[PDB]
Symmetry: D2
Subunit: 494 residues, 4 copies
């Protein structure tokens, strides 16, 4: 059911992509990109700066010209070009699953079955929207005819993160291009390969010159350049809440460009006593350990009800110690390395403070190999709301288990965060599921599951987890501008 | 707290309504409407036949004419009129509720608080839609601009039944008038009175003449004249499954007019073992005995799981025996009389048929008063699928209780029926409520409740319970005609 | 962009198509299908009837069983099967554009570049709708949670005409399968071949057995068997009016199956004094002479304003004589023959009836070749409303030009007609296009163009040209059954 | 016919409105609001600071608590409450108009017939939306049922300007309250009077306490206090760019709250050649001078074709010259005074800068009156692009007239302002209509009319002019939080 991977794939693209050609930086500066399993360097990558972002934007501003072949083309053809791009990604599935694992470190089995599959369904879901987002004819008062046009907002700066580098890419390109925009994309320094290669596939799909430009570089230079740029019409950022504050400040101190954001979470997974014990344990484990725990809506607060707390813990611990950490290309590996040096140390430091503040280390706690950035699956029990490990997104394989008495208690506690990206309820009981699904403050609630995304279901956050929505039809709003036309007519008849 | 009803309200409106003016029938014929509590004549009503229907349709067509006040009026204003109409019905709420009880027989208290409240809410809900039913601007291939207009269908023939006279009038006028149509209404000869007094309010509210015309009379005459009329663009019938067939034929025979039907049902009410026993009993009883059993969506097939069957039956019988039958102007009464002698005899026959086929009579099953049309609340136990009473709609205070073992069994048993209006499920388990709400072939699935309609939420039949939908946004579709305008433009840009 | 055709291409498919397998009739009868260029028998095709249809429905029913492969399949997958089909038809597009031109009669060039291009656009448009036709969540009164599900209607009997036998097939199958219904299709006896080959691509595409089915034959037996089947949920019929009335009666007398119909037309094309003379002239010509005059919205009433009547008429008569008539496989040819001899003689009888009534035959006349069914492009001048060639659907290469004086005049003259499928308006003025496009009683109004369809923009008939719509989001409405689920929840909070 | 004014209306409310009750500030300070038609301080108004904004916010948060009267109300009831409010405003229509004119400058015949007309239509339209904004059920892959809830975004801080006081209050409360939010409102220091009277009606209508809260104060203080609160979920600014780019920074600096904006513009009113002259002149004259020229999308870049400039410009000055200035309570008065001193000398400051660098002054010139902030209607001609008068928004009765040649030319010129809130196109010809509306960058494009706002049609600007739209179905998005619930089910069917 899963083909073999090439474990040392050839890197073809490592430059700034503009007008469908390859560029070295103005400054000529470069940066190495590392393989988190061994810690070794994979290759050098073009470090895009202030003025390389300025270049990317002009080739994009020109792709968006009234009369240009992109502004003119049929909406259903923009679909045809999206579908084409997914056909070719499907063709190079193995190589793209392998390359993602080499630079990101996720198990190869997941790259192929999870990432790239959801890459395919997403792109093919937006292809079919290309010619289906309607404006309105509006029965205004008086002798007028009025109607709306959902036009493209224009040149869209997209800054994407390192955890799901292909899936984030497609989540951003999905709607932008479906709706006729053009995109200046900044890839994460950590994982910039897979994205640049798809830029070759964006060429071969048939996308006009400058529809898509991709600028590798650092946050404080490239990232902040796009956010400040006086001719960029919109900027979408996913990543830490810290860094989102700089993105919304620059966007106000520039050109009143629209903003969207998808920041972290401390998402509660709430297990009522009537849950299916066995289902809830495999799902709470998956909800936190998935993708090495580098998940914006990782279930990092596992709230369990007292009547069942002890059995749940003992099982979670057992499941945690039996999780295989190892070579992400090996078929049996359930957990690969963290993403870089910086994340490795950050996590160890959280584990440290979990220990300092009196949480019960129940397994793991340590470095899981001699080479790479592998951390042991770690579970803390008896966690209290006031502990640092119960307020801050670790973004690693560290589970926190909290005990609750009543449903009115757990709702107040669960909802007691600066974040609200996601939450989940486990229960067999209909009133319970309904009360909680309504009372919880989260962009997405899951009932008897976790991380169930489809390209169809919208996704975003409340509070300081972000604003606006990705996936589904809602994803289209923030990439659309509304124009109203109101025409005097001889005599309005119903 | 309901005000004190005048038990003999005066009748001010007993003629044909055309062009905001009152008329005798061309033949000057009248028929008597009866009080089913007493069996005595309230008054004589004008008998509309073909000539009168043709007059009404002509008035209606004249009002639909391009450049008429009704066609030039702003859509927001159609909404003001419905709000004004709603406020006049509230002003006169005490009289109408007394008149409904007099003519139809339902308890004054139910008429005041259930029926009259739903009329106001339905009319208020549709007042809001009037300027909110958008067409679409469509992203079509080539250098064209394309858009839809939701234009009214035109002259709408509406035929309303007798079980809920005022409410049915609002469910048909509400969505027809909000979209800008004009109506010719046939009200039932058992209960024409409330509808003619509302026509009086229609005029006060300011509706241009000919927008609503109402013809009291008989069905095989006035009702068929509407269905066969060459200048009627649409017919909405609610009534017996048998007459609905006649309505769809005449419409095929005449001018291919549009059709939506609401017909009878034999709705399943399903009760699992883990349902809250006392809530289920009180609801099941209401589901069947409401409005004297005279409900298209009546829970006339109460399946009950074997572990709780005995206790359920014993409780259900008890509440059946304490249900109070008598004068509907008295606040102690929960059940007035059936609407007329025909339905009376029909129900008397259906109970005898019950006894013949081997259903167990557990209470009632005979006559309750020496005058009027009162029948005792009847319960039949150990009912089997093959029994005539399990298969055909009595439309009376006669409960059928059947027994089942597994959830899967009862899905096929509930569904195997040519009717599919509504259904209900009583349980506490999330999974079972979803399984069954998915599997039942019914236009409405109530979970742990029954007879809960919103002005906001669609209602209608599967199979031979009908086609088309009533209330919500969906109620507007069958009253709208789509026009596509496709203009050549110089050069299409996104 | 046009290949070369095998002009007696191998017929692999001429039987009944049930469960992705082929069959003879239960009677073992057959009938011939004729080439309209030559009149010779292309092959035999099995003659289905009540018996076979009854076997199709029973396969369609079983593929629609709850828990079947087609029912449980993801919504996104139905889209993949449709998109695949489009890819297969594109791979046999050359064999199909030829076999279309062969059996129907139209010019290979028009067959390949118009028909199949639209067929591919149709199928890929509807592919995308598959996972996009949302139900709603509804903020009802009280402590309830209320939502709707858009569910398939079931087994849909589909009956298609001979004038666009591929495209008509695609217009029906697209919507039906995207929303997951099962089909029992009767095809035209004059053009069954194409529909049958596409079925083999349906199997090859991977659609489960019993999902899409086909029964070639004669309407007065098989056609009407689909129409009256106790277990067909829906009968879409395209064709004449007379048959549509028969259909709507067959539904009324049987299981109350829903019904949409696409029927005839006498569409007006209206030239204002300030139109673009050359464009208008060339568009008017195509508007009637497209597909040998066998289009439902053929602009078969050309209204011309009096200041330009003379100027317009000569050009049109000149343009009509210039129109090459010959073998459709040739490339000089702009017009091929009529579909069969029954129409051949009908149109001839219409042309006599024209001269006889005093219309000025201005060019053309009768037969245009001594083999096949070829007729001369024919213009009648000075035409009047009371003339049979201005009221009845000729369905052939006969123009009609009529003089008007005022915009108020032509409104009334264009509407005064029992059909309402399409109309067109030619003008440079803004107020005039708006005045006319509002005031014309047509399901589609084209402005400075004609015949501009697309899977996107909806199509259907006012009055007696149809009920219900095809194409766009509107097509899905007829193929969906709406279900309301209303759930009692603990406490409703906004 | 317009009811008799009260030239010096009584004043009742001048304090801070919190929890349905009145309060003076913490510092107990006040300030003056001027009758700008004389210049005499009308009355004193509590000067609000940060700490009173923090009391309103706490009052709103309590009102927004799960289980509170507001959060548990039926969506339909909120609609009932908005309609109630509109009925209270309508009963007081005479007096509110008078109070508005007093503190604002605008003529009584506009305050009553237009501003208040628009207030009423807006509230009533939104009352209709209260229970019709639906979420979605979504056909996701796998055995899940996924659905979206459209939830209140939360505590919304609402700052409105002085140029259309009451209306702008109406545009904010309507959508926000229909969707169940709670309001913290900062009215203008210049015009706090009307907007504070409405709160008294809000109490009377019966809105629970803290749903709406209103704080008169300062731009440097109150404005940024709301913008920076850690408990304000969302803030909507309406004003100018300078002031609007502070709001975007302080919101990010606080808690990443949602921001919608409405800002200034330099709206281009393009009069074409083949257009009508009587209508264009009168309307182009309407586009700017309305409401004493204090008008965000006022038309001040008038591109005339060089076939008509002279003859167009001729009539343009006469009407402008003849435009009456005077007492705002005299029915012949079209134009009133400006609202404050700053604007007065600033508008005079704008005048000077024009002629300086080549601009012909055609009438008015300067100060209209001895007493007040009045201004004679000034008009310029010969204006070129790069001047102060054709780049910066004057917000006063000061017309600019420019000149163009070809149709491609004027586009680029029209699309060269750092703004784009509205635009217009006076033409007769369909193509010039469809082209110019299709390629002008603007939120609204009025054709042959100007300042046509329906309560139904969305309204907001391109680029720097604003984010999101106000009015229409798009007004509700800003006030809505989207939650997805995704439930595991037994077996997903279609
Ligand atoms: O935790 C996450 C996650 O954040 N994303 C993507 C995402 C990115 C930003 C915001 C929300 C979701 C995922 C996709 C698949 C499985 C788990 C997850
Ligand atoms: O010209 C305008 C205008 O700009 N506004 C308000 C507005 C505010 C911000 C953005 C756009 C319009 C108006 C309100 C009423 C009547 C005329 C007008
Ligand atoms: Na790395
Ligand atoms: Na009666
Ligand atoms: Na043939
Ligand atoms: Na004054």
């Amino acid at each position: 059911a899963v083909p073999a991977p090439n474990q040392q794939p050839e890197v073809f693209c490592n430059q700034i992509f503009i007008n469908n050609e390859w560029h070295d930086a103005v400054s000529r500066k470069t940066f190495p990109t590392v393989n988190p399993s061994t810690g070794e360097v994979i290759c050098q990558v073009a470090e895009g700066d202030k003025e390389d972002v300025d270049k990317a934007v002009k080739a994009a501003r020109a792709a968006f010209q009234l009369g240009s072949p992109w502004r003119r083309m049929d909406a259903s053809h923009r679909g045809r070009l999206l579908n084409r791009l997914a056909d070719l990604i499907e063709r190079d599935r193995t190589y793209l699953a392998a390359l993602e694992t080499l630079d990101n470190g996720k198990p190869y089995v997941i790259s192929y079955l999870v990432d790239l599959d959801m890459v395919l369904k997403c792109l093919r879901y937006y292809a079919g929207w290309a010619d289906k987002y309607h404006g309105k004819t509006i029965p205004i008062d008086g002798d007028f005819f009025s109607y709306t046009r959902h036009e493209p907002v224009g040149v869209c700066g997209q800054i994407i993160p390192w955890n799901f580098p292909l899936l984030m890419q497609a989540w951003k390109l999905g709607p932008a291009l479906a709706t006729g925009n053009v995109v200046v994309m900044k890839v994460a320094e950590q994982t910039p390969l897979t994205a640049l290669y798809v830029a070759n596939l964006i060429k071969e799909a048939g996308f006009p010159p400058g529809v898509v430009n991709i600028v590798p570089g650092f946050g404080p230079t490239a990232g902040a350049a796009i956010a400040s740029h006086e001719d960029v019409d919109k900027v979408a950022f996913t990543g830490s809440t810290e860094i989102g504050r700089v993105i919304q400040v620059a966007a106000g101190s520039s050109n009143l460009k629209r903003v969207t954001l998808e920041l972290g979470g401390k998402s509660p997974n709430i297990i009522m006593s009537d849950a299916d014990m066995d289902w809830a344990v495999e799902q709470a484990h998956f909800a936190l350990f998935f993708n090495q725990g580098q998940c914006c809506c990782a279930g990092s607060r596992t709230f369990v009800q007292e009547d069942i707390y002890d059995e749940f813990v003992e099982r979670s611990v057992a499941r945690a110690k039996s999780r295989v950490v190892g070579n992400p290309f090996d078929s049996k590996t359930e957990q690969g390395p963290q993403v870089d040096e910086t994340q490795f140390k950050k996590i160890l430091g959280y584990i440290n403070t979990g220990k300092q503040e009196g949480a019960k280390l129940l397994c793991g706690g340590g470095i899981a190999a001699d080479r790479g950035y592998f951390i042991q699956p770690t579970v803390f029990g008896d966690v209290q709301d006031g502990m640092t490990i119960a307020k801050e997104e670790i973004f690693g394989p560290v589970m926190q288990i909290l005990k609750f008495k009543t449903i009115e208690e757990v709702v107040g506690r669960a909802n007691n965060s600066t974040y609200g990206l996601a939450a989940a309820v486990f229960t067999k009981d209909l009133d319970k599921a309904n009360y909680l699904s309504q009372a919880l403050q989260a962009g997405t609630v899951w009932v008897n599951c976790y991380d169930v995304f489809g390209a169809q279901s919208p996704f975003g956050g409340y509070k300081m987890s972000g604003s606006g929505r990705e996936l589904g039809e809602y994803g289209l709003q923030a990439y659309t501008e509304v124009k109203t036309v109101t025409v005097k007519v001889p005599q309005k008849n119903s």
